[PDB]
Design a protein around this ligand. Structure first.
Ligand SMILES: Nc1nc2c(ncn2[C@@H]2O[C@H](COP(=O)(O)OP(=O)(O)OP(=O)(O)O)[C@@H](O)[C@H]2O)c(=O)[nH]1
Ligand SMILES: [Mg+2]
Ligand code: NA
Lengths: 18, 129, 210, 996
């Protein structure tokens, strides 16, 4: 749960641009 | 002191690279024959300012087109395709010695065909000078 | 040129031996099945980082009625390709027969087994089942003369064995600056005629990607 | 020119002229070469040519001319031997024997002419097949006697025996009758005691390498059939496993022999044989370690270097180790003293498995599968292999393959799954540390990050959920940080794609964590706007892949959400798909249809269906208003593209929804069939105004795409439809009226084969309910399609294939439609089936033979009525002879089993009196004559005229056996195969057909 939420937030900022 | 351990396209610039399939018309039979599929390049020589078509087959890299984009040539449509051009070429040296062909070149899309035609004509203007 | 190797191409009728070679010679894909009578010899050059290499390709007849000299074609062959059709079980069943007759004449040569026609949707000879090559030390490639899937691989592998260099690669042959020909009035009428006929004869395979 | 002189048989053969012709063929080129090739082919095909063969073997000096002379002899011996006088047979045997002895005497000839000697031996072996041992009782004793004198003759005799063994045991199945095979097998078996005694002596005394190698070559062939006693009750295992592994000439062949030894049929309850099986492996592995390379050697590098025969040897070692260990590893597992041997043999396999060679890797991967499967199930066996298994995890992971290479990927996944179960902790560590070496940059490349992603994804489902959760989180976090680390959208794209590849592979994790699943999907939607190559396809492929797995989580209302997420996807569908290509939009709509099928409330499913289809329905409604108000607007190719894309969007949603698609189909159905008609008229108008060339134009192909996608949509719904009353009552009548006549009345080149395909599905699902409709289909498509495809086997290939599928399913479901055909059209139906028999195309041939068989059943089923009796009088012998024609002509070998089955069914009908009429007409035979006697008479005559070189006795016996055996199919097939051999030669033994 705790670790999964941290991971989810980082997922939302995934990009192809710099 | 420790002693240390002991194609002919350098002179040209690439004006246009497009992926295409090339055909030659067999006049004697009633059919087109594929000659190659690869990158078709427009190469401006830096000495002469002369633009040519150079096309190589994938994998083998054998030359399937090699001629000047002459001012007299004319890109006509083919009845079966909205993404091809057909034209007469009086001297191509892909096999070896020069020889006349009736070519057709087809692309992935209509837009690529149209951009090709624009570039072909730009190259033709360069070869009039 | 001076460094040339005899290659025998064998396998059942209709597997695509002649189609495969023609693709390497001219770039064309032949749609029609015109059965080879006996054999046809076709010289085929590749440009490598170790200079040019020439195969004299003995394209042999798969049909028995058109078999001709049969194993007489194999004498002094230095390499070979056995061809079958992945849409035809019987052509893989006959691979041991072609190989038997090949190795009886050519005892110690590099041989490639090619399963042609992998472009076709409904494959009959499953990948799992193709194991004959293992005990006979044949190289195996899935190919397609139509899609060109691995069409270069057989000749690349045999080139490496025959030259004795595993790092041999095909490289780009030298493109000479082409001629600046002005056209005359004499040839114009015949070129104008062929151009009319070419425009009004549809290009084949208009559904393909290129 | 001068070269054609050898084709004149009226004079003596000029031998110098032959050698001109032969040299010009082998060492010449071009026009010269081709002409000589045709002359040699005509020389060889001359039926008298063998008479001039002894002349060529004596007087010609050219070995190619002699080789060709033996091929002419070979041709005679296999095919016309029994027709010769007995003095010719003795004469030919003598100068083949004489030539062979003569060439072995001369050391120079023996060294330099191996090809001509080997061909002479093969020619000798063809004589043995005919004459031995009944007319050559002393061949083997006299072969052994000549072996003691000359070493060259002894070597050549091993080549002769090798070839004999091959031709009797390995290649007899196709080329000989069963009886002749058995005779020759018993004859070899009966005199093998003497033959082995000689082989063993040669191997023990052991002077000449070429003799020893040829003897080991022959031994390899014996091992395929000889009993185990000759290997285990003599000392020959010691020699193979020790002496012959040390020298490299004999090593290659000896290793292959030991591989085949490992496959012998052995008693499984005997300690002495078990010790011997352990010992030869021990000896073999000991020689490898001391003579070839130690356990630690880098076999990847050795194989890559490709020196001499190193690659062949390494392939054969792999084959030896895998073969033996698959059978015998249990023998090495309980004894402490054999433990090191067991693990060293497996360590060689670990090293062989690192070799960069796809087909070798497959060989070793099959063994690893066999091993790890056993360690998963077999009690107390995994602790032995812990260190082998740990290395194998690195090997499999580093060589992981794109899921696209179907077969390889499955084999790898299965092994890596088994290895993950056996030690989950070790698997996690290797993957995490390999991933760390992507972040630090030491192992970094696009290919390397791809392979690790494919590996990590392959083991989904194997870990406990709780471990999987921590594992996935760690992997995704690391991959996210890897993407942020990298620069330039080339690099960022590769990692983002692999990030999304891995999450797609773990649906259990996605199911348990809704917030995360939602973020993934919203992220995929952001990626649907990226232009960079590959990204949009990966986004769409991942979306539908996640959806297939996680359907239910999109259709229910999740806690802390205002609606089911399917509704949120539908609302933004225009904005979400705006930058995608048409086919990508269709994947997206298909994905939504998978989700909509989960909702089992009907009112709500249908509500979501029309919401999803809102954009294409509004595009559609406007285009139907435009094109019906004036047909001019359909000429525009942009409108043709848009229409085809609306239909394809419907096909995509119908594909995933099947029976649930009905309310949407109903919205468009009637206007869609009107569109089919309007489009049909334009196609016919263009073809009349421009010619047949019109069908190639982009314009007309665009219009045909509309017709084909419409046919595809209706086929797709009907194939999955649960309410068949509605299919008949509502869909079918309008469909048949729209499509059948248009097809019938267009020229051949404008007819769509998809019409046939569509009709096949209609008959398949509802043919039983529409007998009048099936009749209408036949009237409209049968005769006109048959005329397109009955001139050659090549033209209209799609129409050809769909045609016989349509007739096949009509013949299964609504056979009564063929009964209503006028007798002339019923005759074209029979002609058409037999026409299918003669195809090489497997799709057509197989359906051809199946239709024939089911038709016979259908007629049998009718019982004793006029139609069944008029069918047998007209068509029974047509089917018997047409089936016989394709069995015996050598061009339809691919159809043998189905031909045999049909032939058997046809013969059984007469043998069981299921035909209730005379198959003969009046005044052709006596009145009381049974069909059985007339069947034998007709067939005798038929075969006599078709194969006139067969004796009356041969034919009578073949038919006598064939009709006895028309219940036992495998035996019947054997009799047919015996007949196919006999028709290739003269003087076949009629007794061969009593084989049992
Ligand atoms: N689909 C598909 N068809 C192929 C391929 N290669 C060849 N064919 C077709 O197979 C047919 C037979 O090809 P051939 O080259 O004539 O066969 P062959 O082995 O030369 O036969 P013989 O010369 O009689 O021994 C031709 O119609 C080819 O167009 C392929 O890669 N894919
Ligand atoms: Mg051929
Ligand atoms: Na995977």
């Amino acid at each position: 749960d705790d670790t999964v939420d941290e991971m989810t937030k980082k997922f939302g900022t995934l990009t192809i641009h710099d | 002191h420790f002693e240390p351990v002991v194609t002919m396209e350098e002179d040209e610039e690439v004006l246009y690279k497009v992926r295409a399939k090339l055909f030659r018309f067999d006049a004697d039979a009633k059919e087109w024959k594929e000659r190659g599929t690869g990158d078709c390049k427009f190469l401006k020589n830096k000495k002469t300012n002369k633009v040519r078509i150079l096309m190589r087959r994938d994998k083998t890299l054998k030359i399937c087109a090699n001629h000047i984009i002459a001012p007299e040539y004319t890109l006509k449509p083919n009845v079966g395709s909205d993404r091809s051009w057909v034209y007469a070429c009086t001297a191509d040296i892909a096999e070896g010695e020069a020889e006349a062909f009736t070519f057709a070149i087809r692309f992935g899309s209509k837009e690529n065909a149209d951009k090709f035609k624009e570039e072909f004509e730009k190259a033709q203007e360069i070869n009039k000078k | 040129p001076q460094v040339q190797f005899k290659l025998v191409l064998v396998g059942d009728g209709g597997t695509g031996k002649t189609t495969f070679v023609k693709r390497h010679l001219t770039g064309e894909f032949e749609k029609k099945y015109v059965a080879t009578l006996g054999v046809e010899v076709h010289p085929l050059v590749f440009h490598t980082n170790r200079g040019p290499i020439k195969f004299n390709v003995w394209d042999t007849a798969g049909q028995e009625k058109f078999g001709g000299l049969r194993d007489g074609y194999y004498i002094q062959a230095q390499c070979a390709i056995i061809m079958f059709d992945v849409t035809s079980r019987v052509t893989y069943k006959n691979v041991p027969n072609w190989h038997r007759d090949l190795v009886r004449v050519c005892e110690n040569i590099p041989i490639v087994l090619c399963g042609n026609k992998v472009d076709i949707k409904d494959r009959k000879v499953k990948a799992k089942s193709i194991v004959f090559h293992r005990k006979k030390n044949l190289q195996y490639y899935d190919i397609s003369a139509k899609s060109n899937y691995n069409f270069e691989k057989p000749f690349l592998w045999l080139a490496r064995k025959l030259i004795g260099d595993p790092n041999l690669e095909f490289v780009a042959m030298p493109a000479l600056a082409p001629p600046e020909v002005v056209m005359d009035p004499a040839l114009a009428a015949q070129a104008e005629h062929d151009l009319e006929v070419a425009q009004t004869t549809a290009l084949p395979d208009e559904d393909d990607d290129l | 020119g001068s070269m054609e002189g050898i084709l004149d048989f009226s004079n003596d053969l000029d031998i110098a002229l032959l050698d001109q012709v032969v040299s010009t063929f082998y060492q010449g080129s071009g026009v010269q070469q081709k002409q000589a090739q045709e002359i040699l082919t005509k020389f060889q095909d001359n039926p008298d040519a063998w008479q001039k063969a002894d002349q060529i073997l004596q007087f010609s000096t050219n070995p190619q001319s002699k080789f060709i002379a033996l091929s002419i002899l070979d041709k005679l011996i296999t095919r016309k031997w029994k027709l010769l006088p007995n003095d010719h047979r003795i004469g030919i045997r003598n100068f083949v024997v004489g030539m062979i002895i003569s060439m072995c005497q001369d050391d120079e000839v023996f060294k330099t002419q191996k090809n001509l000697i080997n061909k002479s031996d093969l020619t000798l072996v063809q004589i043995l097949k005919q004459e031995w041992p009944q007319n050559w009782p002393e061949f083997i004793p006299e072969l052994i006697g000549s072996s003691s004198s000359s070493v060259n003759v002894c070597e050549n005799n091993m080549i002769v025996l090798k070839l004999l063994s091959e031709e009797v045991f390995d290649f007899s199945a196709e080329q000989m009758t069963q009886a002749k095979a058995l005779h020759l097998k018993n004859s070899m078996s009966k005199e093998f005691e003497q033959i082995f005694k000689l082989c063993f002596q040669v191997l023990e005394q052991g002077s000449s390498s070429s003799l020893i190698v040829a003897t080991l070559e022959s031994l390899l062939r014996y091992l395929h059939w000889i009993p185990y006693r000759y290997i285990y009750e003599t000392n020959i295992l010691e020699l193979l496993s020790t002496k012959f592994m040390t020298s490299p000439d004999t090593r290659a062949i000896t290793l292959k022999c030991l591989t085949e030894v490992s496959n012998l049929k052995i008693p499984q309850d005997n300690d002495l044989i078990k010790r011997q099986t352990v010992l030869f492996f021990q000896n073999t592995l000991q020689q490898i370690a001391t003579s070839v390379m130690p356990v630690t050697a880098d076999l990847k590098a050795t194989y890559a270097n490709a020196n001499g025969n190193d690659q062949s040897f390494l392939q054969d070692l792999a084959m030896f180790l895998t073969t033996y260990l698959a059978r015998n590893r249990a023998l090495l597992e309980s004894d402490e003293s054999l433990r090191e041997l067991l693990l060293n043999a497996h360590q060689y396999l670990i090293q062989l498995s690192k070799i960069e060679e796809r087909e070798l890797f497959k060989t070793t991967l099959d063994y690893w599968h066999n091993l790890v499967a056993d360690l998963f199930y077999e009690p107390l066996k995994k602790h032995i292999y812990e260190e082998i298994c740990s290395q194998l995890r690195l090997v499999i992971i580093e060589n992981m393959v794109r899921p696209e290479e179907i077969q390889l990927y499955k084999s790898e996944r299965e092994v890596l799954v088994y290895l993950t179960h056996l030690n989950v902790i070790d698997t996690e560590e290797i993957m995490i540390s390999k991933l760390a070496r992507q972040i630090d940059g030491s192992e970094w490349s696009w290919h390397n990050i791809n392979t690790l992603s494919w590996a990590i994804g392959s083991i989904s489902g194997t870990m406990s959920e709780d471990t999987e959760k921590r594992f996935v989180v760690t992997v995704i976090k690391d991959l996210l940080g890897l993407c942020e680390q990298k620069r330039g959208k080339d690099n960022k794209a590769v990692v983002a794609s692999d990030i999304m590849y891995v999450v797609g592979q773990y649906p259990r994790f996605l199911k348990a964590h809704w917030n995360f699943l939602r973020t993934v999907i919203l992220k995929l939607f952001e990626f649907m706007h990226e232009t960079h190559e590959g990204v949009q396809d990966m986004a769409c492929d991942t979306f539908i892949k996640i959806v297939q797995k996680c359907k239910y989580h999109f259709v229910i209302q999740q806690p802390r959400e205002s609606e089911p997420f399917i509704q949120t996807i539908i609302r933004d569908i225009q904005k979400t798909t705006a930058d995608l290509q048409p086919q990508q939009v269709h994947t997206f709509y298909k994905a939504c249809g998978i989700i909509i099928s989960e909702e089992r409330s009907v009112a709500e499913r249908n509500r979501l269906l029309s919401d999803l289809m809102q954009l294409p329905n509004m595009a559609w409604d406007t285009i139907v208003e435009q094109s019906t108000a004036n047909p001019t607007l359909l000429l525009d190719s942009e409108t043709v593209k848009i229409i085809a894309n609306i239909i394809k969007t419907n096909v995509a949603v119908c594909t995933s929804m099947g029976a649930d698609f009905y309310p949407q189909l109903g919205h468009i159905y009637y206007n869609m069939l009107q569109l089919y008609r309007a489009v049909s008229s334009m196609i016919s108008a263009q073809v009349a105004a421009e010619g047949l060339i019109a069908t190639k134009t982009p314009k007309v192909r665009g219009l045909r795409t509309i017709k084909k996608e419409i046919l595809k949509l209706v086929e797709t719904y009907i194939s999955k439809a649960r309410n068949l009353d509605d299919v008949v009552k509502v869909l079918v009548e309008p469909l048949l009226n729209a499509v059948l006549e248009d097809y019938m009345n267009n020229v051949p080149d404008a007819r769509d084969a998809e019409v046939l395909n569509c009709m096949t599905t209609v008959v398949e699902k509802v043919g039983h309910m529409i007998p009048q409709g099936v009749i209408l289909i036949l009237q409209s498509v049968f005769e006109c399609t048959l005329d397109m495809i009955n001139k050659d086997f090549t033209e209209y290939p799609e129409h050809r294939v769909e045609f016989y599928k349509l007739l096949k399913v009509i013949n299964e479901k609504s056979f009564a439609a063929f009964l209503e055909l006028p007798p002339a059209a019923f005759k074209l139906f029979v002609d058409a089936i037999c026409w299918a028999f003669k195809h090489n195309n497997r799709d057509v041939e197989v359906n051809g033979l199946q239709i024939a068989l089911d038709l016979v059943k259908n007629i049998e089923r009718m019982g004793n009525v006029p139609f069944a009796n008029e069918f047998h009088k007209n068509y029974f012998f047509i089917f018997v002879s047409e089936t016989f024609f394709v069995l015996t002509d050598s061009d339809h070998k691919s159809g043998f089993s189905k031909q045999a089955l049909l032939l058997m069914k046809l013969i059984s009908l007469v043998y069981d009196n299921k035909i209730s009429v005379p198959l003969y007409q009046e005044a052709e035979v006596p009145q009381g004559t049974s069909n059985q006697v007339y069947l034998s008479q007709y067939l005798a005559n038929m075969l006599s005229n078709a194969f006139p070189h067969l004796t009356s006795e041969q034919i009578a016996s073949f038919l006598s056996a064939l009709t006895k055996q028309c219940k036992d199919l495998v035996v019947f097939k054997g009799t047919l195969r015996d007949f196919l051999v006999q028709i290739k030669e003269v003087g076949g033994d009629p007794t061969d057909y009593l084989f049992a």
